[PDB]
Design a protein around this ligand. Structure first.
Ligand SMILES: NC(=O)C1=CN([C@@H]2O[C@H](COP(=O)(O)OP(=O)(O)OC[C@H]3O[C@@H](n4cnc5c(N)ncnc54)[C@H](O)[C@@H]3O)[C@@H](O)[C@H]2O)C=CC1
Ligand SMILES: Cc1cc2nc3c(=O)[nH]c(=O)nc-3n(C[C@H](O)[C@H](O)[C@H](O)COP(=O)(O)O)c2cc1C
Ligand code: SF4
Ligand code: FES
Lengths: 430, 213, 63
């Protein structure tokens, strides 16, 4: 198969995404949730790991690491310490709101995914680190957790299989840096949300020093569907190493901003034209598209015509897939102002532990503010580029790369715009 | 935005603070949610619980939380200063937060901002004279397809225009509680031009289950 | 009020590669000497994971 997109409603995993049906236990049980879970629990961790590594499912958090291998390093015999699965439900990234709808509208899918994942690695309990601002979603998840506890699906003798598993909900306190897995692990333990250094990986030393696997909501909620329908069913979509379905949040300067599931290798132009209703002012009014939120660099209209929205066709397009969050800017937008706002967001969300981010993100914010005001010279611009090259790869966590990438993308794609802005400032005020 | 504390008669270590007995039971449940030997994790929820006692954190809840969990108070100070959702100053009853990140900036969140500023007669980070509102500016809050959006207390008011946020402010001043939802025609996340996807009824259990399971 | 002195050898520091060369230069010129052994610091056993132990006391209070 070579033509992707136009996903049929039968193959969509996330039914009741829009909340038109019941989100509680009885509504979810009539859609396919909690069905033959005890058979999977009896088949066990080797079968679950094989079925999730046959599908080719990667990490939907934004790094794209293979889920089978990542859940496979944790499978090892015990050394006296318990094992834990932790679900990253933070989404501090701008443009991304898919897991909010997953938690609010399909919480039992998340709980069943937690149970299947904890069976895969032999985890003792599950910790769900929801965002601090998401009070209603946390309460909905707690209601669904109590409803599953009442029916005997989890807790004592989970689903009639003899396995012990628990689920906990830990609210955040409004931090983007807590979305990072090691910083999330530290913030669970009651400390400041500052990321650790790998090694040690969380599979060896994680939360409370126990073995730990941190997985996204989107890659956890699809695990029972993978283990039930089959790995080849999930692998039948998309390209090779690009298998499955993906949730896209299209927003910005579009007619109908929305969250919609789609085939993993759908073209960007087809997705924008079909689901979002088109760019404001037509397709010819396009200026720039950010494919995966503020971490991923922007791409102009010249590349957006013939691009595919998977991992490989976007890393080859000098950008990244990220969280698959589409931000659309048309011709009536100041790109430098948008990038300056993104850098201001990155400097307002920075843990300040390690030196290069702590100094260089503020430096980039000041330089970008001077760029927006135009009070700068062209010779500074490449210097700003070098500043990004002194941040990427020299930081503890990947917020430094996620802050250096938009500046590099904006410079590389719109150096003439910046040069025109500063020369207009020079010829006007001087 | 000062990260150091100066002793004032309003905010002193001798400020009266103590949890209610029902909050003591809730704190005990929070502590029992965590493994033994790692009680310090309970610093994160319980301190937030203290905020729900007052709406803000004087330096008497931090010392009390440090005392009931056997942790030094400087760790509680670190926790209260690292995160932005803990109020170390007395905020108003209705704390309004406006998201001005780029997916919300493209859909004119600054229009909402100047409408609120014109209506309430205050600026960003300023409290109303009757202590009913407090307007600040925050980063992204994870509802970017519903841009522009604001958050009041723990409720989300999304997809607003200036008229809707004016109506929300007049409803808050009257004492009623508005519905925490988008003010447009759509409900949660569907496109405004009709449901493009998920129009089929759900298949139900037993569909697509492979053999040998 | 300057620091007056009468010691000609007040600012005489001599540099040697090894202890034996210094001791030979000392006994060559007829100077009584005191020799102090070199205090090499003891190597440690550093571990970043030790800050996140499960049942030990080496857990960091904060970071
Ligand atoms: N989803 C969101 O809200 C956001 C997503 N992102 C995206 O996330 C990515 C950055 O996140 P990272 O976790 O730093 O990416 P990546 O470098 O770390 O690693 C992904 C996962 O693989 C694991 N891993 C990698 N090598 C391993 C090994 N040898 N042994 C065991 N485990 C190993 C890591 O522990 C981690 O859990 C970027 O692609 C960025 O665009 C960025 C910001 C927000
Ligand atoms: C600054 C920063 C913030 C992150 N925020 C999130 C997040 O909010 N949600 C998420 O799933 N992953 C986030 N990640 C990615 C995680 O490091 C990691 O990929 C995730 O916890 C699990 O990814 P997986 O789906 O491959 O298992 C963030 C990474 C960084 C560097
Ligand atoms: S890159 Fe920034 S946010 Fe990440 S560890 Fe370093 S200082 Fe903290
Ligand atoms: S950009 Fe405003 S809610 Fe995300």
């Amino acid at each position: 198969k070579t033509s992707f997109g136009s996903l049929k409603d039968e193959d969509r995993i996330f039914t009741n995404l829009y909340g038109r049906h019941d989100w509680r236990l009885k509504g979810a049980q009539s859609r396919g949730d909690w069905y033959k879970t005890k058979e999977i629990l009896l088949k066990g961790p080797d079968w679950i790991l094989g079925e999730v590594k046959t599908s080719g499912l990667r990490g939907r958090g934004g790094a794209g690491f293979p889920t089978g291998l990542k859940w496979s390093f944790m499978n090892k015999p015990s050394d006296g310490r318990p094992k834990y699965l932790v679900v990253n439900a933070d989404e501090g990234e701008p443009g991304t709101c898919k897991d909010r709808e997953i938690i609010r509208h399909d919480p039992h899918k998340l709980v069943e995914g937690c149970l299947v994942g904890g069976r895969a690695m032999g985890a003792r309990a599950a910790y769900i680190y929801i965002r601090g601002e998401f009070y209603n979603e946390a309460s909905n998840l707690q209601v669904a957790i109590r409803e599953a506890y009442e029916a005997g699906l989890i807790g004592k003798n989970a689903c009639g299989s003899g396995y012990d598993f628990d689920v906990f909900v830990v609210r955040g306190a409004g931090a983007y840096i807590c979305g990072e897995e090691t910083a999330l692990i530290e913030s669970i333990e009651g400390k400041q949300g500052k990321p650790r250094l790998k090694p040690p990986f969380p599979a060896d030393v994680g939360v409370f020093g126990c073995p730990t696997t941190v997985a996204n909501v989107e890659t956890v909620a699809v695990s029972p569907t993978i283990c039930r329908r089959g790995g080849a069913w999930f692998a039948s979509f998309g390209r090779e190493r690009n298998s499955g379905t993906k949730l896209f949040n299209i927003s910005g300067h579009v007619n109908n901003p929305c969250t919609v599931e789609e085939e993993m290798s759908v073209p960007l132009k087809e997705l924008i034209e079909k689901h979002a209703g088109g760019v404001t002012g037509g397709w010819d009014n396009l200026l720039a598209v950010i494919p995966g939120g503020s971490s991923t660099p922007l791409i102009p209209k010249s590349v957006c015509e013939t691009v595919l929205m998977d991992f490989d066709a976007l890393i080859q397009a000098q950008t990244g897939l990220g969280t698959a969050a589409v931000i659309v800017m048309d011709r009536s937008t100041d790109i430098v102002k948008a990038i300056a706002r993104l850098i201001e967001f990155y400097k307002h969300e920075s843990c300040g532990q390690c030196t290069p981010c702590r100094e260089g993100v503020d430096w980039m914010n000041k330089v970008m503010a001077r760029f927006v005001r135009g009070d700068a010279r062209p010779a500074e611009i490449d210097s700003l580029w070098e500043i990004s090259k002194q941040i990427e790869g020299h930081t503890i966590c990947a917020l430094g790369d996620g802050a250096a990438w938009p500046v590099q993308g904006l410079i590389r794609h719109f150096r003439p715009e910046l040069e025109e802005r500063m020369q207009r400032f020079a010829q006007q005020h001087q | 935005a000062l990260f150091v504390h100066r002793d004032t008669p309003k905010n002193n270590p001798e400020t009266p603070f103590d949890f209610t007995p029902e909050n003591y039971k809730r704190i005990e449940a929070i502590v029992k949610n965590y493994p033994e030997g790692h009680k310090a994790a309970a610093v994160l929820p319980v301190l937030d619980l203290a905020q729900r006692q007052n709406g803000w954190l004087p330096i008497s809840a931090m010392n009390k939380v440090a005392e009931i969990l056997q942790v030094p108070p400087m760790r509680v100070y670190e926790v209260a200063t690292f995160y932005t959702m803990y109020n170390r100053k007395p905020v108003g009853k209705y704390h309004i937060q406006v998201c001005t990140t780029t997916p919300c900036m493209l859909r004119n969140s600054d229009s909402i901002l100047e409408a609120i500023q014109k209506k309430l007669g205050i600026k960003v980070g300023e409290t109303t004279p009757d202590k009913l509102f407090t307007l600040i500016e925050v980063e992204c809050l994870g509802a970017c397809v519903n841009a522009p959006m604001v958050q009041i207390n723990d409720n989300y008011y999304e997809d607003l225009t200036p008229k809707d946020i004016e109506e929300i402010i007049d409803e808050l001043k009257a004492g009623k509680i508005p519905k925490p939802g988008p003010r447009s025609g759509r409900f949660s996340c569907e496109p405004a031009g009709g449901l493009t996807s998920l129009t089929e009824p759900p298949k139900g259990p037993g569909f697509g289950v492979q053999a040998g399971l | 009020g300057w620091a007056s002195t009468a010691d000609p050898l007040s600012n005489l520091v001599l540099t040697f590669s090894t202890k034996e060369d210094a001791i030979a230069f000392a006994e060559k010129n007829g100077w009584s000497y005191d020799v102090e052994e070199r205090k090499v610091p003891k190597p440690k056993s550093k571990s970043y994971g030790a800050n996140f132990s499960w049942n030990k006391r080496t857990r960091v209070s904060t970071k």
